[PDB]
């Protein structure tokens, strides 16, 4: 029953915390070239000096969804949140469009956002990566 | 029947049809009961048939009429598990609409929402449609008395009056003849009791052989509340002509 | 770690690493003498010159990384590669609170004798003569 | 309390009596020393016979009240009319789980055929307390003695009305952030009754 | 850290100083402030320790990848634009770090030298001159610069700038490493 | 959505009107002044401040101008989509709810303060909206740096039984007082009248 | 075989990919498109396959602009072609933004070909089933002409054809191509090849799309210009 | 190399517009067809905005198959600026142009988060405090012929310059038919 | 039987048939050959006869430079080789960035084999129908390195190896004409041996043969058509002189 | 895992055809007839209403939908897919265009967005293609009036006049014999009524057919007055009474 998102800070760090981009030469260290972030961005710099509202905005919709699921569990039972989560997971897992980033129509219907617009909708948004094969590897887990 | 696929999932056949949707449609007549919905001047009446062949059953626990919100009632044709699933989802939809937009959910908007969910089920491969037919009745603050029906294919539409069941054709023909005679798309009565009696009379003359107070279920929607009648109320309505 | 003078240079056939073993007493008695230089491998050495825990922990970790690399490639790791591994690791945590200045000294067939200096700021300098300590100007002058 | 926000400086009272409960409040909203709203309805309805009054941040309490009304509509669709204890528990859970980010205090008054009228108070922090009567707000501090000297159990409706009127008139007289008209809601088995009293009436008490 | 760049009629001359990090007695013979981006494009950098070297090596790796992929060399203008993009991207979500870059190239297709300067915020300027570090040299450069200077005259002007700068350095100014980029590639001046 | 890029960079670089709403027996009136100031300088002597959420729902704002414009436009798009979806005329309560939840989501970091008036099948409605997500109902409201003079005028001559003409005159007088007595306000008076059962009437430069 | 053609990620016992082969086969059901590179420009011609009355000819289903220097002729499914065309336009703008220079043609062709190849290697994706003729100019190689098929392979050409009558059109182009031709000669050759290889009664203007690239500007011919050139060449 | 900061002036004539910027080659005025944009502020943000708007206008022309009009471009600039609500570019942009279909002149200015100021007479950006705004107010007259408008804007810039380094100006006079670009290196 | 429908199924005799089918796909590609000399490596490739209207100046070559000291040739599906080559180049640059040392030949071979193996571990992906030959010299080393990689992820080290169409005949010729005791001691001998090996399957001659030579200190040279023509003519003249006697 | 993917539901047949798209086209061809006619002053879009029973209120369900004040659409095929795609198009008109440029999109760009959405359903692992065909009529400042047809595969073409559905071939021939470059909007409406008369088997009156026009701006439909530059909607749906009056004439 949370309104404002809570527990947004990291509690542990490591040099292999990002499994997607790890060096093949030294598997315990991240791959700076394939990160494509400017090459001078250590992970430690991401732990300080953030805008206070950024974490609230990034996790807002997930928090509202979790509160709705908790209310359904309290009032309806386990089956209702189970079914909602199953529907959403099936819809999300069957969609794979490497050339587009827009959400599906059915996802919007399930989220009850058929006729709703937020700034995420208006503003949806290299040398290495950003290709179809990287998305294939990330999606399949290989 | 389906040759290869189309026996499990909802994809097109060579004829351009969705066999799983049609089979879900055929699944709606398993209960072999009928329901009727009519509009009054300021009320909407739904009457459903009760069949309790088993003598060990508790009759008071058998019902296909559900209360969705303060103003909306629903009648389901089909097996009771999918009926209860649909009822719970409709309750959640109405409550969320009220929370999100600041006013009560209208009957037609809820019908459209359920139909959109049904469209999801008809297009996704790993989802099956619910083999039920839903009928929502209310007295909308803008549109007056309202009856809207939704089916497994995702199609929804509003009705002056409607009937659904294995014997829906006879009731539909009788209603059409009556509305031809009266030239009015509703019932000209000032109380919902007269409308209930008229619906009971229509059901009796359409199905035949009549019934007692325990073979019927009646729900009535007014401008303020939707409520289901009890056995004594139905007995009074049967006695009163 | 002790800010005492530490020296390293490479003359013709190896590296001379020199430290002063004048330990500082406290509320303890040592069972044996302490060492100001960490033995990373039978072929690699490092110096602490900073936070003692950081140097000990991360140079033991570097020894593990070098061992795994040598097992994989069936060859001794180059000193440049080991110093680069340590530098990348310390740079990933730059500004978090670490403090360590180490001198990685090694000798390989392909490179020869090599000395690098790695700092907690991410600095990685190859050199011939290094003098880091409380008084290091005198030692550097005597060397030169 | 975020800078530039709106605070609910008010005088809130809720009293249980013989036939039910009564909830009363003033009607003043102030930003600093300026009366931003001279006529405010502070009696918030979350269910047909479950009402509340809010204190602290106005935005936070409005969001919490909206969520509570939504929750009670879901509960009613499933199980029927909830008890005042259930609404108080939902309010407490919302206020406590978010107390590090929201500043909310609630007074809940309710009626049902089982418990026959109840008052709950959730002060800042998220704890819940059930009391025969409750007072809250900046102007309540001036009537802690008076109420403690004038409350009786099982009072009639008129006696409860007079008690609330006198106490809120004193709170209005002494507190700057309070004033305007007195609003009251009477929750009994016979239904919901609304009452309003004007300054020319209660200032002569 | 001091970096100077002078563009002349036929080449680009880049001068850089040594490091002397912090109270560490180092004897070495190398240039740690210069990375060769391509056979006809050189980069000099001056700024905070750690970050600047990481950024320079990242840029060098990207440009080498492009050269291997296309079997073709980018022009100095495209290289400078890519460097500006990467520098502006690095400080997108972190506190900016001190860094100044001089990129000197020789466009073979246009057959002409080019020089660019990029500051820490990501401002790229095409210049005939350039300097970062110690803060007068602009006045001397403005007084003694011609667009049609030869390599020898540019080297003499650079020597004059070095002599002027040495009189204010605290006598620890060691040999400044000077490199020349022209149609024959990149070379280092012994003097 | 809205980006947080270059926040640290900007911090590093740094370290180195009168609006009124009145209610009458068959509708609402919203009026505003037309002076735009970029500080002490008058940028525009005729600037429109009455904005349209929907054909019969209008609003006027103060605070951060870009935030006010963006929030009004976004809520207008949402209202249009919802009205198409339900095949019904939009309601003032729906816009109020959307605005309140959008402003509560951003925790007051969007600096929009609004007066929203309108008519719908349920009647006539006037609301005030705060940047932190709190809303209130009223019969007459004022906003802006000239709001105290306008509120004095409103408190002088307001009563329950008001015709359309009297309401228009009262709103015009409140804006005039803001114009004369406040340095931030001036120039012309823009009005918009909404009645139950009629089109909205938008009168630009009503008195002058 | 029916055992090895249902999925795109399964090899046949002979090492063949049947879904890719079927995607290649689908190309022959599309109208012919011809590209000819002369010594001073490039000519693209395309025969509309679904031409009929009541169709708005003034308002293009086969010739598209990627940027100011690159154009494409399309053979196959038009919706997949539009997807890939929008992707290519975005990639060209990305290259311009990053490097402040216009993207070379071969880089763009290779990017699109990689996208197609990737779409041949995932179980949930089917091949695009489109063929592209790229015509471009860059400062490195000058004028250049490429083709790409659904399998992800691309090739450079002097004169190429894709679509319904590739064999006959290629025979004619082989018999009639000269390295030193001009743009007008290439226009005449392309029109004559389209008139010979077409299965319709006659080659009119309403069944043609025409484009040229020459010093650099792209000219996409209007129907009146097509009619004028048809009259001039004697085809009428 | 300095570059940061500057001034931009836009003025409306009878059937023409004028846009001028200061100059020490780094120029603060760009065009995307028949629409001109002048940016003052941080050099990095000016370059970034120029590249982004070139990107977006090229895509717009490829899709719409027509050049973008000044009003639509103004809306695009406003939305792009508001996207960076909490990390805004340190820029003051000004837009000038002539609408192709109607022929009417158009000038507008923006704040750093996209608030639009549509002025009928003139717009000053960079430093409209010291002398430029007052000089333009004292010199501007409505409905001026292109020669008169050019003289007025050039004189305003010259008067501002005297209020000592190498100073120049770049002026664009835009009519529906042609655009004339001149320099004022004085 | 019913055991060749997925990559995750063993046959009763212990085979995975989709791997063999990917090898069958490789068998249809143009021939590639690699010969390791005393101090050089030679990679030869067979090219299909260029069509008359084909532009023979911009089409990619059959031998690609992964780095300044390592070259790669392939056989099989041409479009998958682009993906593999791009990944190899990115990995070489990443290794240089991470360890300041350029890759060794064996390390790059192992990375390529790892990518190929990783693309065999899901039922939703297709393995690369490519077999590769990777040649080069380790930095500051003078020992030539030649390796072969297969679609399953297996890599091997060879003194001379052929892959692709009709590679068995070329392999038999190499076995007859190549001995590890006395490898060819000059670049000319290695190139001549590679040309003669390719001439056993190449239908036309010098116009269907491509040759790249790798020598220490990162010396990578692509021979022109004229030099290959000279080698072919010399071989033909020697054969004619032998037959005349 | 074997649930991190799902194989493609649309694949190429050995002949080179995508079977699911062809079956969706068949489903479209089994639908009710709809048509569009493009004139010099406007565009007419028309269709035949159908009812499961006479007791249904045909006005509740409308096959003609306003996408923008200047763009409308009609259909042939399956209704729920229509409803989903219309909602998506109405949302996209705002998210992609009006929140960026301050104006509604032209007809062709909205058609392109809808067609992209439809194409993405034919390259998926868990949705079938939409079994529906679209007619979109619109007007914009720099292109005038336009009429487009969109297929289940996502291909769209501009038409001077066209028809889709069960009686599409005969209607196409009748429109071919009755179209010219100088037609007017009223003539187009009359031709559309005549064409629909040949396809409706039952009652051909105002309660069984549905028509809408893209014509001139209707300031009486704006809902507010005071801004001379605010143009009213050009999309207008004809009432049943107007259709009856035109049929009588």
Curated annotation (Swiss-Prot), chain B:
Gene3D superfamilies registered for this protein in UniProt: Glutamine Phosphoribosylpyrophosphate, subunit 1, domain 1
UniProt xrefs under PROSITE patterns: PROTEASOME_ALPHA_1, PROTEASOME_ALPHA_2
GO biological process: proteasomal ubiquitin-independent protein catabolic process; proteasome-mediated ubiquitin-dependent protein catabolic process
Pfam families: Proteasome (PF00227), Proteasome_A_N (PF10584)
Keyword line: Acetylation, Cytoplasm, Isopeptide bond, Nucleus, Phosphoprotein, Proteasome, Ubl conjugation
Cross-link (Glycyl lysine isopeptide (Lys-Gly) (interchain with G-Cter in ubiquitin)): 225
Modified residues (Phosphoserine): 230
Localization in the cell: Cytoplasm; Nucleus
Disulfide bonds: none
Main location, first listed in the record: cytoplasm
Superkingdom of source: Eukaryota
InterPro entries named among the record's database cross-references: Ntn_hydrolases_N, Proteasome_alpha, Proteasome_alpha-type, Proteasome_asu_N, Proteasome_sua/b, Proteasome_subunit_alpha6
GO cellular component: mitochondrion; nucleus; proteasome complex; proteasome core complex, alpha-subunit complex
SUPFAM superfamilies: N-terminal nucleophile aminohydrolases (Ntn hydrolases)
More about this protein: Present with 15200 molecules/cell in log phase SD medium.
Protein family membership: Belongs to the peptidase T1A family.
Complex formation: The 26S proteasome consists of a 20S proteasome core and two 19S regulatory subunits. The 20S proteasome core is composed of 28 subunits that are arranged in four stacked rings, resulting in a barrel-shaped structure. The two end rings are each formed by seven alpha subunits, and the two central rings are each formed by seven beta subunits. The catalytic chamber with the active sites is on the inside of the barrel. Interacts with CIC1.
Identification of the protein by name: Proteasome subunit alpha type-1
Encoding gene per record: SCL1
Swiss-Prot record, chain C:
Effect of residue 54 to N: In DOA3-1; decrease in activity
GO molecular function: endopeptidase activity; threonine-type endopeptidase activity
Keywords assigned by UniProt, alphabetized: Cytoplasm, Hydrolase, Nucleus, Protease, Proteasome, Threonine protease, Zymogen
E.C. numbers: 3.4.25.1
Coiled-coil segments: none
Main location class: cytoplasm
Binding site for bortezomib: 52
GO biological process: proteasomal ubiquitin-independent protein catabolic process; proteasome core complex assembly; proteasome-mediated ubiquitin-dependent protein catabolic process
Active site: 4 (nucleophile)
Root EC class: hydrolase
Single GO cellular component term: cytosol
Record field: catalytic activity: Cleavage of peptide bonds with very broad specificity
Compartment(s) of residence: Cytoplasm; Nucleus
Subunit-level organization: The 26S proteasome consists of a 20S proteasome core and two 19S regulatory subunits. The 20S proteasome core is composed of 28 subunits that are arranged in four stacked rings, resulting in a barrel-shaped structure. The two end rings are each formed by seven alpha subunits, and the two central rings are each formed by seven beta subunits. The catalytic chamber with the active sites is on the inside of the barrel.
Family note: Belongs to the peptidase T1B family.
Other comment: The side chain of Thr-4 acts as a nucleophile, and the N-terminal amino group acts as a proton acceptor. Present with 8530 molecules/cell in log phase SD medium.
Protein's name in the database: Proteasome subunit beta type-5
Organism, as annotated: Saccharomyces cerevisiae (strain ATCC 204508 / S288c)
Upper lineage: Eukaryota, Fungi, Dikarya, Ascomycota, Saccharomycotina
Positions spanned in the full protein: 73 to 216 of 287
Swiss-Prot record, chain E:
Cross-referenced CDD domains: proteasome_beta_type_2
Similarity section: Belongs to the peptidase T1B family.
BP-aspect Gene Ontology terms: proteasomal ubiquitin-independent protein catabolic process; proteasome-mediated ubiquitin-dependent protein catabolic process
SUPFAM superfamilies assigned to the protein according to its UniProt record, in alphabetical order: N-terminal nucleophile aminohydrolases (Ntn hydrolases)
Cellular localisation: Cytoplasm; Nucleus
Keyword Phosphoprotein among UniProt keywords: yes
Role of this protein: Non-catalytic component of the proteasome which degrades poly-ubiquitinated proteins in the cytoplasm and in the nucleus. It is essential for the regulated turnover of proteins and for the removal of misfolded proteins. The proteasome is a multicatalytic proteinase complex that is characterized by its ability to cleave peptides with Arg, Phe, Tyr, Leu, and Glu adjacent to the leaving group at neutral or slightly basic pH. It has an ATP-dependent proteolytic activity. This subunit has a chymotrypsin-like activity.
Positions of post-translational Phosphoserine modification: 75
Official protein name in the record: Proteasome subunit beta type-4
Subunit structure and binding partners: The 26S proteasome consists of a 20S proteasome core and two 19S regulatory subunits. The 20S proteasome core is composed of 28 subunits that are arranged in four stacked rings, resulting in a barrel-shaped structure. The two end rings are each formed by seven alpha subunits, and the two central rings are each formed by seven beta subunits. The catalytic chamber with the active sites is on the inside of the barrel.
The keyword Lyase appears for this protein: no
Principal location class: cytoplasm
Gene assigned in the entry: PRE1
Curated annotation (Swiss-Prot), chain H:
Main location: cytoplasm
GO biological process, one term: proteasome-mediated ubiquitin-dependent protein catabolic process
Source lineage: Eukaryota, Fungi, Dikarya, Ascomycota, Saccharomycotina
UniProt source species: Saccharomyces cerevisiae (strain ATCC 204508 / S288c)
Family: Belongs to the peptidase T1B family.
Protein's cellular compartments: Cytoplasm; Nucleus
Gene, per the UniProt record: PUP3
Keyword terms of this UniProt record: Cytoplasm, Isopeptide bond, Nucleus, Phosphoprotein, Proteasome, Ubl conjugation
InterPro entries: Ntn_hydrolases_N, Proteasome_beta_3, Proteasome_bsu_CS, Proteasome_sua/b, Proteasome_suB-type
Protein name per Swiss-Prot or TrEMBL: Proteasome subunit beta type-3
Keyword Zinc: no
